[PDB]
Design a protein around this ligand. Structure first.
Ligand SMILES: [Mg+2]
Ligand SMILES: [Zn+2]
Ligand SMILES: [Zn+2]
Lengths: 49, 270, 137, 30, 147, 181, 116, 56, 65, 391
RNA sequence: UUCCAGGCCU
């Protein structure tokens, strides 16, 4: 229930934006969780704080 | 100086344990017994609950389940047929023991339900059976469940024969111990070691009761298994000793039923 | 139908337990035709072995002077060509020919291997599978 | 020494304070 | 499943008499296959076990916690302070005969979660039945008896 | 942790001290010295992402500070206490993790993606989502009969309310082939 | 759901003689007894003991599959000796051992004392 | 693409699979549940007339 | 969520021992590890049982009808 | 269903409990696992239809596949991990057990084989009885390396008239291999013959394994004391093999190896160094772990894990990468705020020195992540485009 | 039925 309350949906172009987005960024350190993301589909597009 | 083969040597005793050194037998046997003790020794425990009223927080079956684990007496048992074999349409004092149970939250301060509170209603026929084995300090044993102000719980339990094969509740066992050749002169294992087998792997209390290795000597390839250090515990229902004789017995009977079949089997034919 | 098919005695050139805890492939020379070498693994848990030891290596496919299932004991009385200590039994795969005439046959026992060398195993050593091995001392 | 350094184990107490106030839903709420 | 993406469905259940056992009496409530380790390299699984086998003996809430000063050595030394193998392993006896197990076993508690998704809410079988209207073909979903 | 060299006696250091701490656990005890104070007391800052671009942070507070004196053969192997330009410091690294992850025992010991799975299955397991299910007519939900709090845990769980509302039980697990089932 | 009935582990339902013996033909004088509603508990032990009768050529057993409480026992014997008998013997043999063992455990016990 | 190249069908079943080392390579343990659900039209023949009436 | 009658692993009763434990703590003031050893919980199978249980029941009992 | 053999016809064997309990070897062809995987199954309806499944779709048939003129099924895991152990010269089995083992093989001529050791106590060897499953006319020859008709290390494999003459048995022999005992049997005997073979092999080894036992547990991941320290330097030494080559480039003294930036030509040497190390660092502990080690035993049978695995567990993880370019400076000439600008050193480009046995560091961790996230990323596309391409 | 949404198949 918690994990859901602190979650993030991030829109995309139209079809899987394979590159820039979905990857785990440096600027992500400390803010977003590095391991917790949905397998496949909206992978790396939806984030957990 | 007496007795055929298999021979015990009770190391210690306790109302709840029987550390004994059963020696000179086939490991097969030692285990075959062990097993019997665990799951086939007849017992007695609730197996039917009749919820009339329940305001608890533990929904019916939750409680109904525990009620079955609640160890009940069974010193006799052998004089209380399996409801199934009996002829009474369903059950009777001939096959089962009935208990009651009611609780209300008078103490506006957590009223507790204990196994002690069960109440044998059916004729005990006069025989140690159905008494909520208690090993509690204050004599309450097995906290069934709790309740608040106007919480009420009305039940009706019906304990029958049964054995661990049908469900654990009929387990007089608890947990047996087993070990042999405390040094491994047989090599039944291949100790996993980083460096020193003898270092990393702890030795056993049982090393003493058996001559240590002795490097010199070659390897015994005729080595067999004698002396087995068991420790039959118990839960109550049956005295730690019975959980052993009845084990020695239950098994035994079966081992005979085989002959029984070898006989009945022959008589037949034209 | 039952006779020996080779007798001799050798001396351990060395024993080897490479990565094995109960087996050692060993080898020795002959106390006869110096051309008779020998190779053989051995359950060293049943019959230990040390450098240089005279072990009578006999071989033949038979019982005792006098295919099919394997009776178990009973023979405690029966004929006992076991007048030895070690008595393995397997088969012979290849019959190599180390030039000259110094043929060398390889025999294995359900797992352990063995190889000989020389030439006077002529009319005695058959290409058969059967072949109980033996040792002593 | 009400002003000595601060070993690791300590920080926990700090983080405790955090949530004590904040809350695992801090964001969503505020 | 464990807490290391260690999924798994039961295969069969047994009772003590059949389960393998450690002289102490103790027996597993779960028997996971050794193979699901080397390829996943979920060592932390193993570590959680060694740590819990300790804190379960001393009753000291095992600290897994992200980055910290613990070590297998660190533990294997305490787990050794209780008498059991320093790495966790323990000999066990083949529940059928009682014969030992030439091998030992990494035997210690591990936290496991029962995920919803139980066989029975799935086993679905249809031999003809409910048929759609526009299509006249079987209907979607087991809930509706489709094919 | 704002870590300015505001220390005459020495070098650079946390604008917070063992005192600040006890002063906190003070309130922890009687359930006075807030977090908000730790803020206004210019002791710690809310480092934006952008802003972060212009700072330097010490991982482990202490460790990455004093001088020197053979490391421990059991421990891992961490980089040194380079520079001193440090501006701030990390509360604890374990905080990069989000709920899910934080419940994973020793995540710093698994194949990176493994910790992702656990981040999904915990969201599929059972438990005791709340203690009022008795009065919730939510369409569907399951509660584990006798939930057990885990043995191995994270300092993180403490705040995630776990030992109080677990999602499983510690079962005596035997790793080994047997019947082959 | 599809779970069988617990008791089906020991109650022979609708005619199922415990024993059942079909003559193994693969090899001379040797048979295969099918023990219904039983297991290792009983099996292994009758295997062991049976494996003492010097007049027993072959003896081994096996549980067909965990789901089913049963096991086939195969016994071969020195001709002229009906394996059936060897089972009877190795059988009683167990009881005799047991009996003694029961006795002796009761002996040792009736010579004990402790407070707990 | 979704109705003619691939339809939904009768006489089909699905469940969670769990490996067994006591089966023959080519067998498949079917749960009794499904065994009683899935049928097979069999013609009555003076071959099975017997067995068949039994089943019926 | 109420004590667990008996131990999953081995079975050895544990439904009674509850109240005694909580006491050998708040009162007798002991350390879990021993507390348990005190009440007869030798090997961990039983140990983990108690040491881990979370008596939610209380929190539940604090509601209403 | 992308394989021809992703749908084979099996025999019904109605059983209890709600699961499709299918045999193991036919696991791989369906791409099936048990961690919550389901399977559909249809029922033929006409005498000729079934005929069509039975005569063309039977598993015994699909056994040897044309998409690679080799068998697609074959022994795995427990049976494979076990088959190995069963074999090994160093492994013997006395009577009692052997008698049981014999019995378990459904067929068995019911005629006990001669113990290769009648010597003091009659013994039998894995290889020996394991062959009671192996038919006749079955001939096999291998030769791995030091194989030599009298193969020492049990290299190679030699089976005759259906009896294991020498050499251990594993994935190479029993596997879905090409010259596989399995591939042979099918041909030389029949789809049927071989089909039942998995059965005997399985049931025997499987049963034998039941007792010999087997497992894995941290103790298997800790490499020998010195063999690790010896590594921590095998590491640092490469660092300073970089520190050097680094400044050497911070001086403007390096051949831009035709067609590569000073930058490019630089990193290249760096990377090559780390992995160069990392790997050996691994192997070190590799042939360092005795055979008794479990995690190895499996890797040897070929049932699970490989070099790399043990490497990242017992030795050193490696340099995480995103697009072949080690963790970048998306953080303005640095990897994290935990780094001083313009830091091209490995402790900042994503090189994890620690082993899984020791565990990463907040950095080692986060970089390992970014690297990981990349997997999941394409795994999520390298699957879509795949499926498409397939149809 | 339909329409959108989310989820699960290491
Ligand atoms: Mg799956
Ligand atoms: Zn009655
Ligand atoms: Zn227990």
């Amino acid at each position: 229930t918690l994990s859901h309350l602190r979650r993030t949906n991030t829109p995309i172009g139209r079809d899987g934006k394979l590159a820039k987005p979905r990857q785990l960024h440096n600027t992500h350190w400390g803010l977003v969780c590095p391991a917790e993301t949905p397998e496949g589909q909206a992978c790396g597009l939806v984030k957990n704080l | 100086m007496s007795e055929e083969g298999p021979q015990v040597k009770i190391r210690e005793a306790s109302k709840d344990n029987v550390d004994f050194i059963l020696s000179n037998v086939d490991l097969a046997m030692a285990n075959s017994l062990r097993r019997v003790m665990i799951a086939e020794i007849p017992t007695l425990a609730i197996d039917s609950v009749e919820v009339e009223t329940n305001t608890t927080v533990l929904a019916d079956e939750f409680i109904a389940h525990r009620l079955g684990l609640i160890p009940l007496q069974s010193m006799d048992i052998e004089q209380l047929e399996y409801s199934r074999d009996c002829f009474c349409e369903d059950h009777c004092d001939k096959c089962s023991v009935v208990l009651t149970l009611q609780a209300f939250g008078e103490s506006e301060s957590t009223t507790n339900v204990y196994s002690k509170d069960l109440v044998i209603v059916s004729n005990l026929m006069g025989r140690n059976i159905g008494h909520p084995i208690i090993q509690d300090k204050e004599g309450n044993g097995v906290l069934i469940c709790k309740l608040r102000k106007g919480q009420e719980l009305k039940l009706t339990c019906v304990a029958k024969k049964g054995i661990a094969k049908e469900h654990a509740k009929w387990g007089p066992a608890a947990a047996i111990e087993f070990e042999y050749d405390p040094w491994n002169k047989l090599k039944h294992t291949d100790y996993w070691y980083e460096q020193d087998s003898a270092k990393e792997w702890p030795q056993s209390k049982n090393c003493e009761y058996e001559d240590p290795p002795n490097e010199g000597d070659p390897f015994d390839y005729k080595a067999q298994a004698d002396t087995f250090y068991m420790n039959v515990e118990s839960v109550g229902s049956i005295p730690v000793d019975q959980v052993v004789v009845r084990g020695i017995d239950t098994l035994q009977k079966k081992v005979a039923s085989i002959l029984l079949a070898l006989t009945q089997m022959d008589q037949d034919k034209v | 139908m039952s006779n020996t098919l080779f007798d001799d005695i050798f001396q351990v050139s060395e024993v080897d337990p490479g990565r094995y805890n109960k087996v050692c492939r060993i080898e020795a020379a002959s106390t006869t035709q110096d051309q008779c070498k020998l190779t053989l693994d051995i359950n060293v848990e049943l019959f230990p072995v040390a450098a240089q030891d005279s072990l009578t290596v006999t071989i033949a496919s038979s019982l005792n002077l006098e295919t099919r299932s394997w009776r178990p004991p009973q023979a405690g009385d029966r004929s006992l060509a076991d007048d030895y200590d070690y008595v393995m039994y397997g088969t012979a795969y290849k019959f190599e020919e180390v030039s000259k005439d110094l043929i060398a046959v390889y025999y294995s026992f359900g797992g352990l291997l063995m190889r000989l060398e020389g030439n006077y195993r002529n009319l005695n050593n058959l290409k058969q599978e059967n072949a109980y091995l033996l040792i002593r001392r | 020494d009400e002003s000595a350094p601060i070993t690791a184990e300590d920080s926990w107490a700090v983080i405790s304070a955090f949530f004590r106030e904040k809350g695992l839903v801090s964001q969503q709420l505020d | 499943a464990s807490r290391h993406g260690q999924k798994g469905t039961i295969g069969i259940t047994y009772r003590r008499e059949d389960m393998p056992f450690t002289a102490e009496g103790i027996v597993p409530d779960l028997i996971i296959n050794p193979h699901a380790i080397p390829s996943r390299m979920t060592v932390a699984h193993l570590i959680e076990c060694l740590l819990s086998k300790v804190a379960a003996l001393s009753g000291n809430e095992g600290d897994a916690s992200p980055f910290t000063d613990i070590t297998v050595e660190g533990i294997s030394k305490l787990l050794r302070e209780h008498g059991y193998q320093s790495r966790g392993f323990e000999v066990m006896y083949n529940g059928h005969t009682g014969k030992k197990l030439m091998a030992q076993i990494f035997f210690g508690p591990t936290y496991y979660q029962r995920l919803r998704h139980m066989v029975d809410d799935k086993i679905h079988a249809r031999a003809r039945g409910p048929m759609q209207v526009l299509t006249r073909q079987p209907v979607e979903g087991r809930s509706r008896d489709g094919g | 942790f704002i870590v300015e060299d505001d220390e005459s006696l020495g070098h650079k250091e946390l604008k917070v001290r063992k005192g600040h701490i006890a002063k906190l656990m003070a309130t922890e005890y009687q359930d006075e010295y807030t977090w908000s104070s730790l803020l206004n007391e210019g002791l710690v800052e809310y480092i934006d992402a952008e802003e972060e671009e212009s700072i330097l942070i010490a991982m482990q507070p202490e460790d990455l500070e004093p001088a020197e004196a053979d490391v421990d053969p059991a421990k891992r192997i961490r980089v040194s206490h380079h520079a001193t330009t440090f501006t701030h410091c990390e509360i604890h690294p374990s905080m990069i993790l989000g709920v899910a992850a934080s419940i994973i025992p020793f995540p710093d010991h698994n194949q990176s993606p493994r910790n992702t799975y656990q981040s999904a299955m915990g969201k599929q397991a059972m438990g005791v989502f709340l203690t009022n299910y008795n009065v919730r007519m939510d369409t569907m939900a399951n509660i584990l009969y006798y939930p057990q709090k885990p043995l191995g845990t994270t300092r993180a769980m403490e705040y995630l309310k776990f030992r109080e509302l677990p999602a499983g039980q510690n079962a005596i697990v035997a790793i080994a082939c047997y019947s082959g089932y | 759901m599809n779970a069988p009935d617990r008791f089906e582990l020991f109650l022979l339902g609708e005619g199922e003689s415990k024993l059942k013996i079909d003559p193994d033909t693969k090899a001379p004088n040797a048979v295969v007894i099918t023990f219904e509603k039983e297991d290792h508990t009983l099996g292994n032990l009758i295997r062991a003991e049976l494996l003492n009768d010097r007049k027993v050529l072959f003896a081994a057993y096996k549980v067909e599959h965990p789901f089913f409480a049963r096991f086939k026992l195969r016994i071969q014997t020195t001709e002229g000796y009906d394996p059936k008998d060897a089972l009877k013997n190795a059988c009683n043999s167990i009881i005799n051992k047991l009996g003694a063992l029961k006795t002796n455990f009761e002996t040792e016990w009736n010579l004990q004392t402790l407070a707990a | 693409r979704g109705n003619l190249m691939g339809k939904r069908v009768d006489f089909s079943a699905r469940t969670v699979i769990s490996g067994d080392p006591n089966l023959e390579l080519d067998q498949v343990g079917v749960p009794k549940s499904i065994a009683k659900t899935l049928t097979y039209p069999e013609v009555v023949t003076p071959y099975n007339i017997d067995r068949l009436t039994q089943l019926v | 969520m109420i004590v667990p009658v008996r131990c999953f692993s081995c079975g050895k009763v544990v439904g009674d021992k509850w109240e005694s434990y909580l006491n050998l703590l708040q009162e007798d003031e002991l350390d879990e590890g021993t507390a348990l050893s005190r009440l007869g919980l030798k090997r961990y199978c039983c140990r983990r049982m108690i040491l881990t249980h979370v008596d939610l029941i209380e929190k539940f009992l604090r509601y209403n009808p | 269903s992308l394989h021809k053999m992703s749908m084979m016809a099996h025999r019904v064997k109605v059983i209890p409990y709600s699961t499709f309990r299918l045999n193991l070897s036919v696991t791989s062809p369906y791409n099936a696992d048990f961690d919550g995987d389901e399977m559909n199954l249809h029922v033929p309806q006409s005498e000729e239809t079934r005929a069509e499944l039975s005569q063309l779709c039977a598993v015994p048939l699909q056994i040897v596949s044309p998409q690679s003129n080799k068998p697609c099924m074959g022994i795995v895991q427990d049976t494979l991990c076990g088959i190995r152990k069963l074999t090994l010269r160093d492994t013997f089995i006395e009577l009692d057990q052997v008698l049981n083992m014999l019995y378990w093989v459904p067929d068995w001529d019911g005629v006990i084989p001669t113990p290769a050791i009648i010597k003091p106590k009659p013994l039998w060897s894995g290889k020996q009885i394991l062959s009671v499953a192996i038919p006749n006319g079955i001939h096999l020859q291998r030769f791995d390396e030091g194989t030599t008709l009298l193969s020492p290390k049990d290299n190679g494999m030699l089976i005759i008239d259906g009896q294991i003459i020498f050499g251990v048995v594993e994935k190479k022999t029993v596997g879905s291999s090409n010259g596989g005992l399995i591939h042979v049997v099918t041909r030389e005997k029949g789809p049927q013959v071989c089909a039942k073979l998995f059965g005997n092999i399985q049931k025997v080894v499987n049963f034998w394994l039941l007792h010999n036992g087997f497992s894995t547990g941290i103790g298997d991941t800790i490499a020998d004391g010195p063999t690790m320290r010896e590594i921590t330097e095998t590491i640092a030494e490469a660092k300073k093999k970089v520190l050097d080559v680094t400044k050497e480039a911070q001086a403007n003294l390096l051949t831009a190896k035709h067609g590569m930036t000073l930058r490019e030509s630089f990193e290249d040497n760096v990377v090559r160094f780390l992995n160069e190390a990392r790997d050996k660092a691994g192997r070190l502990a590799e042939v360092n772990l005795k055979d008794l080690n479990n995690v190895k035993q499996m890797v040897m049978a070929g049932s699970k894990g490989s070099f790399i695995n043990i490497a990242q567990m017992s030795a050193c993880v490696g340099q995480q990468s995103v697009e072949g370019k080690r963790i970048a400076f998306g953080f303005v000439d640095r990897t994290l705020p935990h780094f001083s600008k313009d830091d091209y050193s490995p402790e900042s480009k994503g090189f994890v020195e620690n082993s899984y046995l020791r565990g990463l560091t907040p950095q080692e961790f986060f970089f390992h992540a970014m690297g990981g996230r990349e997997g999941l990323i394409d795994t999520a596309v390298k699957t879509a485009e795949t499926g498409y391409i397939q149809r």
